[PDB]
Amino acid sequence: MHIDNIENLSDREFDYIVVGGGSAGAAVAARLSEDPAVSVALVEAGPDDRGVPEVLQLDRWMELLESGYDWDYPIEPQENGNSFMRHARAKVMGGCSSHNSCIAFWAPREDLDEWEAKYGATGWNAEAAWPLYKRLETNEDAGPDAPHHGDSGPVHLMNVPPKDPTGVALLDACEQAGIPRAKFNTGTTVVNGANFFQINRRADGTRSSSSVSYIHPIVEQENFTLLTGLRARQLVFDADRRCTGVDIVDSAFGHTHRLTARNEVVLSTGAIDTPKLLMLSGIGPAAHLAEHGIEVLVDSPGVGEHLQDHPEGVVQFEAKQPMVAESTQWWEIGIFTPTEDGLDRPDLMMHYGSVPFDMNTLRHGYPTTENGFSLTPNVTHARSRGTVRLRSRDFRDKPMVDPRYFTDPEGHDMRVMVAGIRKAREIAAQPAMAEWTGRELSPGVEAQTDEELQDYIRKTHNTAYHPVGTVRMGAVEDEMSPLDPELRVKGVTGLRVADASVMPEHVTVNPNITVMMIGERCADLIRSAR
Ligand SMILES: *Cc1cc2c(cc1C)Nc1c([nH]c(=O)[nH]c1=O)N2C[C@H](O)[C@H](O)[C@H](O)COP(=O)(O)OP(=O)(O)OC[C@H]1O[C@@H](n2cnc3c(N)ncnc32)[C@H](O)[C@@H]1O
């Protein structure tokens, strides 16, 4: 059942409680509920997404930013980046899978094999992931000549139709520039190639969000309880340090209500909110906890550390002809390319947008247009690392989010980003684009030297919206990895984390499908443990 008023819930005890009904959390809860002998509650601060067309219609996603569906986290002042940048985070069923552009990627097998081989996460490799991606998807490319793909999973992936003539021309221009058309999600990593994406969207235009895919079909299921509009402020522990539940607050008076879990609690509130919720519960770096008066239950120096992202630049152009009036999600093509020889993974990815993107360029006086297109390069394996810290002991205060963009000591992130701008301009200047590409609006042709392009990036960069890794899994004996390879929070029992915060290293591609895969794996870890 769906419960949007806690006063309507009489039994507040479950076998499992999943906190956060986002990309991973909806997956974990759906999959746990598949055992009819088990009771599952999924707790979500935002509202039910059922019948909210602004959330369900994928082509409207850009309107969700800074709406009532966005927690809206601005960042701390940036030493070498853009202090005006905001981390949009969805506050609704489905989480960010309910606000995103639905770009859908299997992670490179080389990213996933490294989790085990390089970052200590025993059991986390392509072998473990491959069957989970197949289970989770129904993919338009499924068939006997691509047997890795799923044809029955709840998450529908489809090919973006190549209708946009500017995008067709852009791909022709990539080819002229030495970047061929490539198939995505074949299981072989695209190092140098470009194409229209696969998107996780249904035929009727509805996003195939985690809530749509896993949760709408089971809302009436006997052993499953969905609680929306309720915000976890603290996890509850035994004298034995067994997590026994969560304190949640209603939206009416802000009273606190306790829910109890008999087996496990699963925290899935995402890379920004999960570290905050663990810190509020006494799990985190001891000295940081003490600065806010919080009793330390576990000194877990890695909580809130290792924040990773795909920082993103922009090159905008006037179009010489009318741009498309309709689209799947306005950001329909991706281009991968290496800036260096000998890579098994692209170090640079660019999105092509059939709209101007002047969120961070207008305040610096760059001209804009109502008819143009954007190329947005992003650094796939950024080496900068930031933090998420408490702003106070009050759960209602937004956390301090400091990604430290472009601070890696070797200047890697900034180097790749300058090369991405130069590459975006090289592609837009190919013969196949000559009847599309007008004036470069930003950074503009007066910006040519490494210094000018660095100064532009520092001012105008954005994010792909891919924060990860603030509560990472790692070796049982690594003190900086708050989780063991089974996703259990070290130092307490009965508690696991499953969302983007677990990644020990970012993946090369847009991470959503991977985060749902992480949900699917957590459910299996749980089911096998009992
Ligand atoms: C916001 C964003 C992110 C993505 C795109 C765009 C934008 C604007 N586009 C995109 C993405 N990924 C792709 O692969 N392709 C794309 O085109 N984005 C990133 C991806 O969308 C996110 O990385 C991924 O969903 C993160 O998943 P998650 O780690 O499971 O986190 P969610 O935010 O999905 O779920 C958290 C969930 O918990 C609720 N919450 C937060 N705090 C609380 C508390 N205290 N109590 C209860 N519930 C809480 C949130 O409301 C949210 O629903």
Coordinates of C-alpha atoms and ligand atoms in Angstrom, one line a residue:
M1 CA 0.0 0.0 0.0
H2 CA 0.8 3.6 -0.5
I3 CA 0.8 5.6 2.8
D4 CA 1.1 9.4 2.5
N5 CA -0.1 10.1 6.0
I6 CA 1.9 8.3 8.8
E7 CA -1.1 8.5 11.1
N8 CA -2.7 5.9 8.8
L9 CA 0.1 3.4 9.5
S10 CA -0.6 1.2 12.5
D11 CA 2.2 -1.4 12.4
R12 CA 5.5 0.4 12.1
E13 CA 7.7 -2.7 12.2
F14 CA 9.0 -4.4 9.0
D15 CA 11.6 -7.0 8.1
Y16 CA 13.5 -4.4 5.9
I17 CA 13.4 -0.7 5.6
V18 CA 14.8 1.0 2.5
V19 CA 15.3 4.7 3.0
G20 CA 15.2 6.7 -0.3
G21 CA 13.1 5.6 -3.2
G22 CA 15.7 6.6 -5.8
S23 CA 17.5 4.8 -8.6
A24 CA 19.0 2.2 -6.3
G25 CA 16.5 2.3 -3.4
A26 CA 13.4 1.4 -5.5
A27 CA 15.4 -1.4 -7.0
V28 CA 16.5 -2.8 -3.7
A29 CA 13.0 -2.6 -2.2
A30 CA 11.2 -4.1 -5.2
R31 CA 13.7 -6.9 -5.3
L32 CA 13.4 -7.6 -1.6
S33 CA 9.7 -7.7 -1.7
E34 CA 9.8 -10.6 -4.2
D35 CA 9.9 -12.9 -1.2
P36 CA 6.3 -13.0 0.0
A37 CA 7.5 -14.1 3.6
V38 CA 9.3 -10.8 4.0
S39 CA 7.7 -7.3 4.8
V40 CA 9.4 -4.3 3.2
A41 CA 8.9 -0.5 3.7
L42 CA 10.3 2.0 1.2
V43 CA 10.5 5.5 2.9
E44 CA 10.8 8.6 0.6
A45 CA 10.9 12.3 1.6
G46 CA 9.4 13.5 -1.7
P47 CA 5.9 12.8 -3.1
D48 CA 4.6 9.9 -5.1
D49 CA 5.4 10.4 -8.8
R50 CA 2.1 8.8 -10.0
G51 CA 0.1 11.3 -12.0
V52 CA 2.7 14.1 -12.0
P53 CA 3.2 14.7 -15.7
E54 CA 6.2 17.0 -15.2
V55 CA 8.1 14.2 -13.7
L56 CA 6.8 11.3 -15.9
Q57 CA 7.1 13.0 -19.3
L58 CA 10.8 12.8 -20.1
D59 CA 10.9 15.7 -22.6
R60 CA 9.9 18.1 -19.7
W61 CA 12.9 17.1 -17.4
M62 CA 14.8 20.4 -17.8
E63 CA 11.9 22.2 -16.1
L64 CA 12.4 20.1 -12.9
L65 CA 15.6 22.0 -12.0
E66 CA 15.1 24.3 -8.9
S67 CA 11.3 23.4 -8.8
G68 CA 9.6 21.9 -5.7
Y69 CA 10.9 18.6 -7.0
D70 CA 14.6 19.6 -6.5
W71 CA 16.4 19.6 -3.1
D72 CA 18.6 22.2 -4.7
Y73 CA 22.1 22.0 -3.1
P74 CA 24.3 24.9 -4.0
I75 CA 28.1 24.2 -3.5
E76 CA 30.7 25.7 -1.2
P77 CA 32.9 28.5 -2.8
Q78 CA 35.3 26.9 -5.3
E79 CA 39.1 27.4 -5.2
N80 CA 39.4 26.7 -8.9
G81 CA 35.8 26.5 -10.3
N82 CA 32.3 27.9 -10.5
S83 CA 30.9 29.0 -7.2
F84 CA 27.4 29.6 -8.7
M85 CA 27.0 25.9 -9.6
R86 CA 24.1 24.0 -8.0
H87 CA 23.8 20.3 -7.5
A88 CA 20.2 19.6 -8.5
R89 CA 18.9 16.5 -6.7
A90 CA 15.4 15.1 -7.2
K91 CA 13.0 15.0 -4.3
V92 CA 10.3 12.6 -5.5
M93 CA 9.7 8.9 -6.0
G94 CA 12.3 7.5 -8.4
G95 CA 14.8 10.1 -7.1
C96 CA 17.2 11.5 -9.8
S97 CA 15.9 8.7 -12.1
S98 CA 12.8 10.8 -12.0
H99 CA 14.5 14.1 -13.0
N100 CA 17.3 13.1 -15.3
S101 CA 17.7 13.0 -19.2
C102 CA 17.5 9.2 -19.1
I103 CA 20.8 8.6 -21.0
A104 CA 21.3 4.8 -20.5
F105 CA 24.7 3.1 -20.3
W106 CA 26.2 -0.2 -19.2
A107 CA 29.5 0.8 -17.5
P108 CA 32.7 -0.2 -19.3
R109 CA 33.7 -3.8 -18.2
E110 CA 37.2 -2.2 -17.5
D111 CA 35.6 0.2 -15.0
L112 CA 33.8 -2.5 -13.1
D113 CA 36.8 -5.1 -13.0
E114 CA 38.8 -2.4 -11.3
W115 CA 36.5 -2.2 -8.4
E116 CA 37.7 -5.6 -7.3
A117 CA 41.2 -5.5 -8.9
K118 CA 42.3 -2.1 -7.8
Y119 CA 39.9 -0.7 -5.1
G120 CA 39.6 -3.9 -2.9
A121 CA 35.9 -4.4 -3.5
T122 CA 35.9 -8.2 -3.4
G123 CA 33.2 -9.7 -5.8
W124 CA 32.6 -6.4 -7.8
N125 CA 33.6 -7.0 -11.4
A126 CA 32.0 -7.3 -14.8
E127 CA 31.2 -11.0 -14.2
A128 CA 29.0 -9.9 -11.2
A129 CA 27.5 -6.9 -13.0
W130 CA 26.8 -8.4 -16.5
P131 CA 23.9 -10.6 -15.5
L132 CA 22.4 -7.8 -13.3
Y133 CA 22.3 -5.3 -16.2
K134 CA 20.6 -8.0 -18.3
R135 CA 18.1 -8.8 -15.6
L136 CA 17.2 -5.1 -15.1
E137 CA 16.6 -4.2 -18.7
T138 CA 14.3 -4.8 -21.6
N139 CA 16.6 -3.5 -24.4
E140 CA 15.5 -2.8 -28.0
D141 CA 18.9 -4.3 -29.1
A142 CA 18.2 -7.6 -27.3
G143 CA 18.5 -10.8 -29.5
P144 CA 20.8 -13.7 -30.4
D145 CA 23.5 -11.6 -32.0
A146 CA 23.8 -9.5 -28.7
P147 CA 23.0 -12.2 -26.0
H148 CA 24.4 -10.0 -23.1
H149 CA 21.2 -7.8 -23.4
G150 CA 18.0 -8.4 -21.4
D151 CA 14.6 -8.7 -23.1
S152 CA 12.4 -9.0 -20.0
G153 CA 13.7 -6.5 -17.3
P154 CA 11.4 -3.8 -15.9
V155 CA 13.6 -0.9 -17.2
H156 CA 12.9 -0.3 -20.9
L157 CA 15.8 0.9 -23.0
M158 CA 15.3 2.2 -26.4
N159 CA 17.3 3.7 -29.3
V160 CA 16.8 7.5 -29.8
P161 CA 15.4 7.8 -33.4
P162 CA 17.8 9.7 -35.6
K163 CA 15.2 12.4 -36.5
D164 CA 17.2 15.6 -35.6
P165 CA 19.0 16.7 -38.8
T166 CA 21.5 18.7 -36.9
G167 CA 22.5 15.6 -35.0
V168 CA 22.7 13.5 -38.2
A169 CA 25.0 16.2 -39.6
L170 CA 27.0 16.3 -36.3
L171 CA 27.7 12.6 -36.5
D172 CA 28.7 13.0 -40.1
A173 CA 31.0 15.7 -38.8
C174 CA 32.4 13.5 -36.1
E175 CA 33.3 10.9 -38.8
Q176 CA 35.1 13.6 -40.8
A177 CA 37.0 14.4 -37.7
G178 CA 38.2 10.8 -37.1
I179 CA 35.3 9.8 -34.7
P180 CA 33.2 7.0 -36.2
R181 CA 29.6 6.1 -35.6
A182 CA 29.5 3.5 -32.9
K183 CA 27.0 1.2 -31.3
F184 CA 26.4 1.8 -27.6
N185 CA 26.0 -0.9 -24.9
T186 CA 27.3 -3.7 -27.0
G187 CA 29.5 -4.7 -24.0
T188 CA 32.6 -3.5 -25.7
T189 CA 33.8 -0.2 -24.6
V190 CA 33.6 2.8 -27.0
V191 CA 36.9 4.6 -26.7
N192 CA 36.5 6.6 -30.0
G193 CA 33.0 6.8 -31.3
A194 CA 29.7 8.8 -31.2
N195 CA 26.0 8.1 -31.8
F196 CA 22.4 8.8 -30.8
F197 CA 22.0 7.3 -27.2
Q198 CA 20.0 4.6 -25.8
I199 CA 17.5 6.1 -23.3
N200 CA 15.6 4.4 -20.5
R201 CA 12.1 5.6 -21.7
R202 CA 8.9 3.8 -22.6
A203 CA 7.3 4.0 -26.0
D204 CA 4.6 6.4 -24.8
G205 CA 7.1 9.1 -23.6
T206 CA 7.1 8.2 -20.0
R207 CA 10.6 8.0 -18.4
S208 CA 11.5 4.4 -17.4
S209 CA 12.5 5.7 -13.9
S210 CA 13.2 3.4 -11.0
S211 CA 9.7 4.1 -9.6
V212 CA 7.9 3.5 -12.9
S213 CA 9.8 0.4 -13.5
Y214 CA 10.1 -1.4 -10.1
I215 CA 7.5 0.3 -7.9
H216 CA 4.3 1.3 -9.8
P217 CA 3.5 -2.4 -10.5
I218 CA 3.8 -3.6 -6.9
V219 CA 2.3 -0.7 -4.9
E220 CA -0.7 -3.0 -3.9
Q221 CA 1.5 -6.0 -3.2
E222 CA 0.7 -7.5 0.2
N223 CA 4.1 -7.4 1.9
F224 CA 5.1 -4.0 0.5
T225 CA 4.5 -0.6 2.1
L226 CA 5.3 2.7 0.4
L227 CA 5.6 5.8 2.6
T228 CA 6.1 9.2 0.9
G229 CA 6.4 12.7 2.2
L230 CA 8.5 11.4 5.1
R231 CA 12.0 12.4 5.8
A232 CA 14.6 10.3 7.8
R233 CA 16.5 12.5 10.2
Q234 CA 18.5 9.7 12.1
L235 CA 19.1 6.0 12.1
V236 CA 18.3 4.2 15.4
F237 CA 20.8 1.8 17.0
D238 CA 20.9 -0.9 19.8
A239 CA 23.2 -1.0 22.8
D240 CA 24.8 -3.7 20.7
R241 CA 25.2 -1.3 17.7
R242 CA 22.6 -3.2 15.7
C243 CA 20.6 -0.7 13.6
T244 CA 16.9 -1.2 14.6
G245 CA 15.3 1.4 12.4
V246 CA 14.9 5.1 11.4
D247 CA 13.3 8.2 12.9
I248 CA 11.3 10.0 10.3
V249 CA 9.5 13.3 10.2
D250 CA 6.2 14.2 8.7
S251 CA 5.5 17.3 6.6
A252 CA 2.5 18.5 8.8
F253 CA 4.1 19.5 12.2
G254 CA 7.5 17.9 12.0
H255 CA 6.9 15.4 14.6
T256 CA 9.3 12.4 14.8
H257 CA 8.1 8.9 14.2
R258 CA 10.1 5.8 14.7
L259 CA 10.0 2.8 12.3
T260 CA 11.5 -0.5 13.3
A261 CA 13.2 -3.1 11.1
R262 CA 13.6 -6.7 12.2
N263 CA 16.3 -7.7 9.7
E264 CA 18.2 -4.8 7.9
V265 CA 17.9 -1.2 7.1
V266 CA 19.1 -0.1 3.6
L267 CA 20.2 3.4 3.2
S268 CA 19.7 4.6 -0.3
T269 CA 19.4 8.3 0.0
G270 CA 22.2 9.1 -2.6
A271 CA 25.7 10.5 -2.7
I272 CA 24.8 13.8 -0.9
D273 CA 22.1 12.8 1.6
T274 CA 23.5 9.3 2.7
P275 CA 26.7 10.7 4.1
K276 CA 24.6 13.4 5.9
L277 CA 22.2 10.9 7.4
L278 CA 25.1 8.6 8.6
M279 CA 26.8 11.6 10.2
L280 CA 23.7 12.7 11.9
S281 CA 23.4 9.2 13.3
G282 CA 26.9 9.3 14.8
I283 CA 28.7 7.5 11.9
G284 CA 31.5 9.7 10.3
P285 CA 34.9 11.4 10.8
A286 CA 35.2 11.8 14.6
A287 CA 36.5 15.4 14.6
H288 CA 33.8 16.6 12.2
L289 CA 31.1 15.0 14.4
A290 CA 32.5 16.7 17.5
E291 CA 32.4 20.2 15.9
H292 CA 28.6 19.7 15.7
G293 CA 28.2 18.1 19.1
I294 CA 27.4 14.7 17.8
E295 CA 28.3 11.7 19.9
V296 CA 30.5 9.4 17.8
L297 CA 29.0 5.9 17.4
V298 CA 31.6 4.9 14.7
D299 CA 34.7 6.9 13.7
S300 CA 34.5 6.3 10.0
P301 CA 36.8 8.8 8.4
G302 CA 35.7 8.0 4.9
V303 CA 32.1 9.1 5.3
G304 CA 31.6 12.2 3.2
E305 CA 35.1 11.9 1.6
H306 CA 36.1 10.9 -2.0
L307 CA 33.3 13.0 -3.6
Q308 CA 33.6 12.5 -7.4
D309 CA 31.8 13.9 -10.3
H310 CA 31.8 14.5 -14.1
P311 CA 32.5 18.2 -14.4
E312 CA 31.2 19.6 -17.6
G313 CA 32.1 22.5 -19.8
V314 CA 30.1 24.1 -22.6
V315 CA 30.5 25.4 -26.2
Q316 CA 27.4 27.1 -27.6
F317 CA 26.7 28.0 -31.2
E318 CA 24.1 29.9 -33.1
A319 CA 22.3 27.6 -35.6
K320 CA 22.1 28.8 -39.2
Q321 CA 18.7 27.1 -39.7
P322 CA 15.7 26.4 -37.4
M323 CA 16.5 23.9 -34.7
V324 CA 14.1 21.0 -33.9
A325 CA 11.0 21.9 -32.0
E326 CA 10.5 18.4 -30.5
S327 CA 12.9 15.9 -28.9
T328 CA 13.1 12.9 -26.7
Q329 CA 15.1 14.8 -24.0
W330 CA 17.1 17.5 -25.9
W331 CA 20.5 15.8 -25.3
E332 CA 20.4 12.9 -27.8
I333 CA 24.0 12.2 -28.9
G334 CA 27.2 11.4 -27.1
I335 CA 30.8 11.5 -28.3
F336 CA 33.6 9.7 -26.8
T337 CA 37.2 10.4 -27.6
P338 CA 40.6 9.9 -26.0
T339 CA 42.9 12.9 -25.5
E340 CA 45.9 10.5 -25.1
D341 CA 47.2 7.3 -26.8
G342 CA 47.0 3.9 -25.1
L343 CA 43.6 4.3 -23.2
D344 CA 41.2 1.5 -22.8
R345 CA 38.5 4.0 -21.8
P346 CA 37.7 7.5 -23.3
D347 CA 39.0 10.3 -21.0
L348 CA 36.6 12.8 -22.5
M349 CA 32.9 12.5 -23.3
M350 CA 30.7 15.3 -24.9
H351 CA 26.9 15.6 -25.0
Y352 CA 25.3 17.4 -27.9
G353 CA 22.3 19.5 -26.9
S354 CA 19.8 20.8 -29.5
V355 CA 19.3 23.9 -27.3
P356 CA 21.5 26.7 -26.0
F357 CA 22.8 26.0 -22.4
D358 CA 23.5 29.4 -20.9
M359 CA 22.8 28.7 -17.2
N360 CA 26.4 29.6 -16.3
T361 CA 27.4 31.8 -19.3
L362 CA 24.9 34.6 -19.2
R363 CA 26.0 35.9 -15.8
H364 CA 29.5 36.5 -17.3
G365 CA 28.1 38.4 -20.3
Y366 CA 28.3 35.8 -23.1
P367 CA 25.7 36.5 -25.8
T368 CA 23.0 34.0 -26.1
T369 CA 20.3 32.9 -28.6
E370 CA 16.9 31.2 -28.8
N371 CA 18.1 29.0 -31.8
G372 CA 21.3 27.2 -31.3
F373 CA 23.0 24.0 -30.0
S374 CA 25.6 23.1 -27.3
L375 CA 28.5 20.7 -27.0
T376 CA 29.2 19.9 -23.4
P377 CA 32.5 18.1 -22.8
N378 CA 32.9 16.2 -19.6
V379 CA 35.9 14.7 -17.8
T380 CA 35.0 10.9 -17.5
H381 CA 37.6 10.1 -14.8
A382 CA 38.1 13.4 -13.0
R383 CA 41.0 13.2 -10.5
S384 CA 39.7 16.0 -8.2
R385 CA 38.1 14.8 -5.0
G386 CA 35.7 16.8 -2.7
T387 CA 33.6 16.3 0.4
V388 CA 30.2 16.4 1.8
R389 CA 30.0 17.7 5.4
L390 CA 27.4 18.7 7.9
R391 CA 26.5 22.4 8.0
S392 CA 25.1 21.9 11.6
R393 CA 23.5 19.3 13.9
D394 CA 20.1 20.3 12.4
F395 CA 18.8 17.7 9.8
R396 CA 16.9 20.4 8.0
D397 CA 20.1 22.4 7.1
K398 CA 21.4 21.6 3.7
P399 CA 24.9 19.9 3.8
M400 CA 28.0 21.6 2.6
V401 CA 28.9 20.1 -0.7
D402 CA 32.5 20.9 -1.9
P403 CA 33.4 18.9 -5.0
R404 CA 36.8 20.9 -5.3
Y405 CA 36.5 21.0 -9.1
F406 CA 39.8 21.3 -11.0
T407 CA 42.0 20.9 -8.0
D408 CA 43.8 17.6 -8.9
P409 CA 47.5 18.3 -8.3
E410 CA 48.5 17.2 -11.8
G411 CA 46.0 19.6 -13.5
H412 CA 44.4 16.6 -15.3
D413 CA 40.8 17.6 -15.1
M414 CA 41.5 21.1 -16.5
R415 CA 43.8 19.7 -19.3
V416 CA 41.1 17.3 -20.5
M417 CA 38.5 20.0 -20.3
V418 CA 40.5 22.5 -22.5
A419 CA 41.2 19.7 -25.0
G420 CA 37.3 18.9 -25.0
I421 CA 36.5 22.5 -25.9
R422 CA 39.1 22.5 -28.7
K423 CA 37.7 19.2 -29.9
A424 CA 34.1 20.4 -29.7
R425 CA 35.1 23.4 -32.0
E426 CA 37.0 21.1 -34.4
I427 CA 33.9 18.9 -34.8
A428 CA 31.5 21.9 -35.2
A429 CA 33.9 23.2 -37.9
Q430 CA 33.8 20.1 -40.2
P431 CA 32.3 20.4 -43.7
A432 CA 29.2 18.3 -42.7
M433 CA 28.2 21.0 -40.2
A434 CA 28.9 24.0 -42.4
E435 CA 25.2 24.7 -43.0
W436 CA 24.4 24.5 -39.3
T437 CA 27.3 26.0 -37.2
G438 CA 26.9 29.7 -36.9
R439 CA 28.8 32.0 -34.6
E440 CA 30.4 30.5 -31.5
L441 CA 28.6 32.3 -28.7
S442 CA 30.8 30.9 -25.8
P443 CA 33.6 30.9 -25.2
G444 CA 33.8 32.8 -28.5
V445 CA 36.7 32.9 -31.0
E446 CA 38.7 35.5 -29.1
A447 CA 39.4 32.7 -26.5
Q448 CA 42.3 30.7 -28.0
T449 CA 45.2 30.2 -25.5
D450 CA 45.2 27.5 -22.7
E451 CA 45.0 30.5 -20.2
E452 CA 41.9 32.0 -21.8
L453 CA 40.1 28.6 -22.1
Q454 CA 41.1 27.8 -18.4
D455 CA 39.8 31.1 -17.2
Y456 CA 36.5 30.4 -19.2
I457 CA 36.1 26.9 -17.7
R458 CA 36.7 28.1 -14.1
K459 CA 33.9 30.7 -14.6
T460 CA 31.3 28.8 -16.6
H461 CA 31.6 25.1 -16.0
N462 CA 28.7 23.0 -14.8
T463 CA 28.4 19.3 -13.8
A464 CA 26.9 16.3 -15.6
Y465 CA 25.0 15.8 -12.3
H466 CA 26.8 12.6 -11.5
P467 CA 28.1 12.9 -7.9
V468 CA 29.3 9.6 -6.5
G469 CA 31.5 7.8 -4.0
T470 CA 31.0 9.6 -0.6
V471 CA 30.3 6.3 1.3
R472 CA 32.6 4.0 -0.7
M473 CA 32.9 0.1 -0.5
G474 CA 36.5 -1.2 -0.2
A475 CA 38.7 -3.7 1.5
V476 CA 37.5 -4.9 5.0
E477 CA 40.8 -3.6 6.4
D478 CA 40.8 -0.1 4.7
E479 CA 39.7 2.4 7.3
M480 CA 38.9 5.1 4.7
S481 CA 36.2 2.8 3.1
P482 CA 33.2 3.0 5.3
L483 CA 31.6 -0.1 3.6
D484 CA 32.8 -3.6 3.2
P485 CA 32.5 -5.4 -0.2
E486 CA 29.0 -6.6 0.9
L487 CA 27.8 -3.0 1.3
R488 CA 27.6 -3.3 5.1
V489 CA 28.5 -0.2 7.2
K490 CA 31.6 -1.1 9.1
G491 CA 31.4 -0.8 12.9
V492 CA 27.6 -1.4 13.3
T493 CA 25.4 -4.4 12.2
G494 CA 22.0 -4.5 10.5
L495 CA 22.8 -1.6 8.1
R496 CA 23.8 -1.4 4.5
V497 CA 24.1 1.4 1.9
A498 CA 23.1 1.0 -1.8
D499 CA 23.1 4.0 -4.1
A500 CA 25.8 6.0 -6.0
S501 CA 27.7 6.8 -2.8
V502 CA 29.3 3.3 -2.8
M503 CA 31.4 3.5 -6.0
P504 CA 35.1 3.4 -5.2
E505 CA 35.9 5.2 -8.5
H506 CA 33.5 6.9 -10.9
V507 CA 32.5 5.0 -14.1
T508 CA 33.3 6.5 -17.5
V509 CA 29.6 6.9 -18.6
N510 CA 26.3 8.4 -17.2
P511 CA 25.9 6.3 -14.0
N512 CA 22.1 5.8 -13.6
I513 CA 21.8 2.3 -15.0
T514 CA 24.9 1.3 -13.0
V515 CA 23.3 2.7 -9.8
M516 CA 20.2 0.5 -10.4
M517 CA 22.6 -2.4 -11.0
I518 CA 24.1 -1.6 -7.5
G519 CA 20.5 -1.8 -6.1
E520 CA 19.9 -5.2 -7.8
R521 CA 23.2 -6.5 -6.4
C522 CA 22.5 -5.3 -2.8
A523 CA 19.1 -7.1 -2.9
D524 CA 21.0 -10.3 -4.0
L525 CA 23.6 -9.8 -1.2
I526 CA 20.8 -9.5 1.3
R527 CA 18.8 -12.5 0.0
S528 CA 21.9 -14.7 0.0
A529 CA 23.0 -13.6 3.5
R530 CA 19.7 -15.0 4.9
Ligands
LIG1 C1 19.9 15.2 -11.3 C2 20.5 14.6 -12.4 C3 21.2 13.4 -12.5 C4 21.3 12.7 -13.7 C5 20.9 13.4 -14.9 C6 20.4 14.6 -14.6 C7 20.2 15.4 -13.6 C8 19.5 16.7 -13.5 N1 21.0 12.8 -16.1 C9 21.5 11.5 -16.1 C10 21.9 10.9 -15.0 N2 22.4 9.7 -15.1 C11 22.4 9.0 -16.2 O1 22.9 7.8 -16.1 N3 21.9 9.5 -17.3 C12 21.4 10.7 -17.3 O2 20.9 11.3 -18.5 N4 21.9 11.5 -13.7 C13 22.5 10.9 -12.5 C14 21.7 9.8 -12.0 O3 20.4 10.1 -12.2 C15 22.1 9.7 -10.5 O4 23.5 9.5 -10.4 C16 21.4 8.5 -9.9 O5 20.0 8.7 -10.1 C17 21.6 8.6 -8.4 O6 20.9 7.5 -7.9 P1 20.8 7.2 -6.3 O7 22.2 7.1 -5.8 O8 19.9 6.1 -6.0 O9 20.2 8.6 -5.6 P2 18.7 9.2 -5.9 O10 18.9 10.7 -5.7 O11 18.2 8.6 -7.2 O12 17.9 8.6 -4.7 C18 17.9 9.2 -3.3 C19 16.4 9.4 -2.9 O13 16.4 9.5 -1.5 C20 15.5 10.6 -1.1 N5 16.1 11.2 0.1 C21 17.2 12.0 0.2 N6 17.3 12.3 1.5 C22 16.3 11.7 2.2 C23 15.9 11.6 3.6 N7 16.5 12.2 4.5 N8 14.8 10.8 3.9 C24 14.1 10.2 3.0 N9 14.5 10.2 1.7 C25 15.5 11.0 1.3 C26 15.5 11.5 -2.3 O14 14.2 12.3 -2.4 C27 15.7 10.6 -3.5 O15 14.4 10.1 -3.9

